[PDB]
Amino acid sequence: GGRENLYFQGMAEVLMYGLSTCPHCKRTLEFLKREGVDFEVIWIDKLEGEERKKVIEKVHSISGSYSVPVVVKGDKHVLGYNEEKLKELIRG
Ligand SMILES: [Mg+2]
Ligand SMILES: [Mg+2]
């Protein structure tokens, strides 16, 4: 193995990238929970080594930054905890 995660590869309808220790990421997770949408989360801090580096580069390829949280739906994303932008992403 020789293997890769389905959700890393775009199969979630909604995907969050974050760190479990970050309060902006915590807030965004609680937003998504409350929203009631099926979503997945990748905690980059729970990854190590090349697997972590790969997810970091993926986050960058989506937002153009090395910051989190990033929430992705289809071809759109929100970088950071912003409730208005997250509601627009999920609902619009
Ligand atoms: Mg966008
Ligand atoms: Mg944004």
UniProtKB/TrEMBL annotation:
Transmembrane segments: none annotated. GO terms for molecular function: electron transfer activity. It comes from Archaeoglobus fulgidus (strain ATCC 49558 / DSM 4304 / JCM 9628 / NBRC 100126 / VC-16). PANTHER family: GLUTAREDOXIN, GLUTAREDOXIN-LIKE PROTEIN NRDH. Residues 14-78 form the Glutaredoxin domain. Coiled coil: none annotated. CDD domains: NrdH. SUPFAM superfamilies: Thioredoxin-like. This is Glutaredoxin (Grx-1). It holds the Pfam family Glutaredoxin. GO terms for biological process: cell redox homeostasis.
